[PDB]
Symmetry: C4
Subunit: 176 residues, 4 copies
């Protein structure tokens, strides 16, 4: 896709939704009300490579849980917003602070609360399992599903657009 | 016709296991349970409620997990440990002064079938038992616990011309 | 022919992991397990029991989780931590006074094979090791943990003409 | 035949954990503790491999007692966790066992496995491996990690070494 590659070039900030994007969208509940969530190892590797390439990252979530706080910290995610349903307001405040334009922002989502952002940013993507209305209004859909490498693919699409994937791969393959 | 059946709906009822969940039962060594729901499903149920359709759950099982989940979503009527689902329904229909033709029901297995057979919009999830699928008016594309409920909700919103308005909150 | 092999069945025997579950083992840090079962399977086992076929589980692993699940389902005979499945079965058969031809067994791996090869209806689930699939009388279309046990129960009920009645309950 | 040929000389079979022995999911509870899932087909395959005289190892960049217990339950003789440089660890282990790269098989799913995968005699990826790894491995299993890929890999080695029949024989009497 000419359009996605081109949209990838200007990205300085990559924002992820949590449930449905970093997870497969399942909520595990125990009888006491505590939760379990699941993330994916390909995704963690993708996010680390993206950050190492100079792209900053953020998560904006309508829910709130220490599990997400821990995961974000482990991956080096620099900006974490939880318990925020108004995602565009949150983003606008982040961008005012970092002084970036919408065209410098990539966002990966799965559902309606992600849509006001997806519609505005430079690289607004849906995961394959995303609500179809969100799919139809995004710039691109990942092939992989959330919690199954969608976030990794998003990461690689950006690294590739910016000419940085090859360098990332050379760390692990001696021929390049 | 499915859209026609959807128009008249005033009450949408869900089974739990196999419909709000994927049918899996998780047990720890001491017998406590874990259960999985889906976020697409929650957004769908919240949008149906907002549209003015009331919702209920009827389950043969019983767990605090489901009470919490029902409350978090604003589900107005919850019946658990009830194997006789049509008797539960009849009672609720009395309280609400509704007939069968105004009830949608989303089910996955034999105990849901007496209801599915009788209501205005009786649907099975994709993973439902084949015999239930055969006797339902419709079958969702999505599987239970993987957005079959969100799909059921939108079907009803769409049928009632309320889906565009629910989307408009996010396109402004 | 499978329908023919189903007729004489008086005892139905299940492996646990990969048959009543998807083959996944969940472990927590402290070392304790979580196991997952499926609601279609439970409904299927209850109907088969109600038709007058008795049920058993033979497993090489051992956990209180499986004991509780067996009890909840009304599974009559439970053997865990058993390496030689054929030895265990021979003894149960002597005690119940049945021949191999009256036994159905559903398994997923090598330890199940000596039984599967000897009984009247020796079946593998879809996700079974291919060597076991190749030496079974039949293979369920569904995967373990995902309704393969249900499917196996319905094959017996159907072979014995009892499925139609089991369904009728839900058509009234 | 190429894979069959590489399998002949194997004396050590090494596995990544996440994405190879598991489907790659990481389960976290509120208090930080984890759950991990393994697969019973995989356990049988690994036990059969060991029984044939091929030793086994695990090299992971993560660290959890769950893996320690799983490896001990399966009889996996060598375990290294928290190890970012997988080759460095393999080299240390090979000198101890006095084995060479050509006698090693490795089953991986992501970039940190690729340098080992490129060095060894039988360097395989699972079906769900990052595609760049799949492209550079000697071979790819049909099965996905956590769903029998390890079993399929074990059986490849067993068969290559004329040992699968004997493994199956126990169950044909
Ligand atoms: Cl990770
Ligand atoms: Cl939700
Ligand atoms: Cl059940
Ligand atoms: Cl095992
Ligand atoms: Mg989401
Ligand atoms: Mg159900
Ligand atoms: Mg088994
Ligand atoms: Mg890995």
């Amino acid at each position: 896709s000419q359009d996605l590659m081109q949209r990838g070039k200007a990205i300085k900030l990559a924002v992820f939704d949590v449930d449905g994007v970093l997870t497969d969208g399942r909520l595990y509940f125990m009888e006491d009300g505590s939760e379990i969530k699941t993330f994916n190892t390909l995704d963690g590797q993708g996010i680390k490579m993206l950050i190492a390439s100079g792209v900053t990252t953020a998560i904006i979530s309508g829910r709130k849980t220490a599990i997400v706080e821990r995961r974000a910290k482990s991956l080096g995610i620099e900006h974490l917003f939880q318990g925020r349903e108004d995602k565009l307001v949150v983003l606008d405040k982040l961008l005012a602070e970092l002084q970036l334009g919408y065209e410098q922002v990539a966002y990966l989502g799965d559902d309606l609360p992600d849509l006001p952002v997806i519609r505005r940013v430079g690289l607004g993507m849906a995961v394959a399992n995303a609500a179809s209305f969100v799919r139809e209004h995004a710039h691109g859909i990942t092939r992989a599903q959330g919690g199954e490498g969608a976030a990794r693919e998003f990461c690689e699409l950006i690294l590739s657009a910016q000419g940085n994937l090859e360098a990332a791969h050379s760390v692990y393959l001696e021929g390049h």
